[PDB]
């Protein structure tokens with residue numbers, strides 16, 4: 001069995017890609033490739049490389065977002081449990097500014113979503129716990145919270161269908177709701 | 179909170195590094211960085227880039243190994259559950275050829291292990307289930323199972339301390355024990 005990626009662009013959000021890796025399944029579990037440069041480099045303009053891997057461990061009913069920055073391409077997935085992954089178009093000059101798309105990523109939908117910069121990254125944890133993996137590609141220093149923009153998870157102008165009105169939020173994600 | 183790494187070289191096997199990231203902890207859980215080019219690329223010779231990310235989900239009692247190849251640098255960890263990660267020195271020219279070191283890796287002990295080429299990689303799943311993450315750095319094409327070596331998980335010459343006599347194995351990891 002060889003390493004394969006099914007790739008298609010979102011039908012809702014221009015420049016968002018849905019990457020589906022194949023998996024080797026046996027008695028022991030599964031092996032899969034989330035990323036090679038060879039297959040997924042072309043999703044990102046010349047010079048810009050994926051150079052940064054993060055794991056985010058969250059409990060049930062946690063919502064992180066909506067976070068973006070001006071320079072970071074993100075490849076996001078859930079490698080344990082289940083997240084309602086939601087991308088918002090936060091490009092103010094996009095014909096789909098503040099449109100959104102949900103990807104419910106779990107054991108039975110192992111997708112990686114590619115966000116270009118100026119997009120809203122968010123996830124809600126619908127499992128008991130979830131491990132969120134994401135690769136970042138940017139030039140220069142990491143955009144930490146102070147260099148990032150924030151929209152409210154429940155911003156009326158976005159209207160994301162979340163499975164709860166009452167998520168567990170950081171102070172940053174609460175401040176965005178005022 | 180700045181992204182940070184504690185980097186230490188094994189006391190047992192020259193060229194094996196133990197990487198410990200810091201974690202942001204809050205009401206929601208934890209955020210941590212497993213890898214940046216800026217901090218970890220200097221572990222690998224100039225030229226060779228980490229360019230391949232893999233995930234292995236395994237049941238309790240699964241043992242995968244001992245697998246290596248002549249060109250692949252690996253950065254390995256467990257991002258859910260718990261594994262006995264065992265590194266073996268399989269460099270026939272090293273004075274610790276067939277010496278081994280164990281790391282029991284979990285959220286509570288988040289070590290990433292850097293393996294140079296010609297080293298034996300293995301892990302056993304001690305938890306209900308485990309997600310094993312590993313970055314590969316290599317020149318050119320992936321070394322698949324035909325381009326790999328395999329040492330028997332229980333090879334007498336290594337004598338690894340495993341928490342079981344009867345792990346769940348692949349055909350090739352079973353062959354190793356009889357061949």
Ligand SMILES: Nc1nc2c(ncn2[C@@H]2O[C@H](COP(=O)(O)OP(=O)(O)O)[C@@H](O)[C@H]2O)c(=O)[nH]1
Nearest residue numbers: 001002003022023024031032033242245323348
């Ligand atoms: N789809 C996919 N299959 C893989 C990958 N890596 C290995 N395989 C397949 O899984 C099978 C077992 O590979 P092996 O290297 O023996 O696995 P291990 O025993 O878990 O280290 C072989 O057919 C491989 O071709 C991967 O990243 N993606």
Ligand SMILES: Nc1nc2c(ncn2[C@@H]2O[C@H](COP(=O)(O)OP(=O)(O)O)[C@@H](O)[C@H]2O)c(=O)[nH]1
Nearest residue numbers: 064067144145179180181200201202209210211
């Ligand atoms: N140690 C460490 N801290 C981080 C990392 N990423 C973010 N942080 C810190 O965690 C906190 C929350 O960051 P934020 O981007 O709002 O996280 P989010 O709400 O999960 O998207 C801030 O204090 C960051 O500095 C990391 O990779 N390692």
Ligand code: NA
Nearest residue numbers: 339340341342
């Ligand atoms: Na034993």
